[PDB]
């Protein structure tokens, strides 16, 4: 709902489009588990397509905890300091890829 | 359950009630279709086709005298004595492709089956049994587990 929800005007960080573009996504922190059927998506993600993801995006940095977790999470930190925590609990590999890619795109 | 009435109140009438109208089975008269069904005599069919099938499979040996006990041990025919089947009757079907030469014992027999068996050289003999007699015959072991 609009009136209950806050509002804002459009504004890009630092006017990124004029000069050289910079990925506003700074850091990722994956929290996965060895066991747990929910974390199989993340485990196979880090197996296969985290490597090429990092190769494609050198500007972003990635940390992985890989600890006991009932629900695997992904945390994203941006240049403003904005944080986005998302639950990849029992989630498909391609959908995780789309999610991380749109998080890289998001400001 | 519907909106209102017997439908969702759960008070629909018995089965076969048409709102006071005379039901179908009530207006239809009575006739002697099934009377003494629990006393009518029954016999289970047996085909010469099936008999040749069993002889070829070799579960029942024609070298020895065939009886309904050997049939039930070969699972050629199932029997339900307390369902008032006083035995087994042969069937005209299967007169061809039949070379058994069997010394078959039966309860009921078809003249054509008898002719076929006699042509092939076999023997047919009819023998009447009681209900409990037939029970102890088609299941001898349980009768012997008692000691009578």
């Amino acid at each position: 709902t609009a009136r209950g929800t806050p509002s804002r005007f459009l504004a890009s960080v630092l006017h990124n489009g004029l000069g050289r573009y910079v990925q506003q996504l700074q850091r990722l922190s994956f929290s996965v588990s060895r066991d747990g059927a929910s974390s199989r998506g993340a485990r196979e993600f880090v197996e296969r397509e985290v490597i090429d993801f990092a190769r494609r995006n050198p500007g972003v940095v990635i940390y992985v905890n890989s600890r006991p977790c009932c629900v695997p999470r992904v945390v994203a930190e941006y240049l403003n300091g904005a944080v986005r925590e998302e639950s990849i609990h029992c989630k498909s590999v391609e959908e995780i890829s789309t999610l991380v890619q749109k998080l890289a795109d998001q400001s | 359950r519907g909106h209102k009435g017997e439908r969702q109140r759960g008070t629909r009438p018995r089965l076969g009630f048409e709102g006071g109208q005379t039901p179908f089975y009530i207006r239809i008269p009575k006739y002697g279709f099934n009377e003494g069904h629990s006393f009518r005599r029954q016999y289970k069919p047996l085909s010469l086709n099936r008999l040749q099938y069993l002889i070829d499979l070799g579960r029942v040996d024609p070298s020895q005298p065939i009886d309904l006990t050997q049939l039930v041990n070969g699972r050629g025919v199932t029997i339900q004595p307390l369902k008032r089947d006083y035995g087994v009757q042969l069937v005209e079907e299967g007169a061809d492709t039949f070379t058994a030469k069997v010394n078959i014992e039966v309860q009921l027999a078809s003249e054509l089956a008898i002719a076929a068996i006699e042509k092939n050289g076999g023997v047919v003999t009819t023998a009447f049994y009681d209900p409990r007699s037939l029970d102890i015959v088609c299941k001898p072991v349980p009768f012997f587990l008692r000691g009578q």
Binding site: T1, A2, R3, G4 | -
Partner: protein, 140 residues
């Protein structure tokens, strides 16, 4: 009891979250809120078309006002623009009239000249040289 619900708190506090800013006992209570929140959401849906229509009417009013400021009226202006093959929607027309009135004056003068060409054509349909701006481009 063998099965009892424990998350009632949360599954109602989501509704109360959406109804926090309301007035009276609606924001506090639930059954007074549910009947209202669903109503608010249905109104949020049905408000989209009304937003469209109202903003359209607003652009209409602004364009009519600017035209009368230049001496033109909206129906004639739009007809002449369409005849002269310029599909400027009402949003950008109003924005142009606001932020750069000179271009809007040029557009209004164009529309008036096209009206005059159309009147000359009404006098004589053919048998005359067509208006210079009423001329059209043919694509293929």
């Amino acid at each position: 009891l063998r099965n009892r619900v424990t998350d009632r708190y949360f599954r109602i506090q989501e509704v109360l979250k959406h109804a926090r800013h309301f007035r009276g006992r609606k924001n506090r209570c639930y059954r007074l809120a549910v009947r209202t929140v669903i109503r608010a959401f249905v109104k949020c849906t049905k408000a989209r078309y009304l937003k469209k229509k109202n903003m359209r009417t607003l652009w209409i009013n602004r364009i009519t006002a600017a035209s009368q400021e230049h001496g033109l009226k909206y129906p004639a202006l739009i007809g002449n623009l369409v005849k002269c093959q310029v599909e400027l929607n009402r949003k950008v027309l109003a924005d142009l009239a606001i932020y750069e009135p000179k271009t809007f004056k040029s557009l209004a003068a164009l529309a008036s000249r096209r009206r005059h060409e159309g009147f000359a054509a009404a006098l004589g349909d053919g048998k005359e040289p067509e208006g210079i701006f009423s001329r059209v481009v043919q694509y293929h």
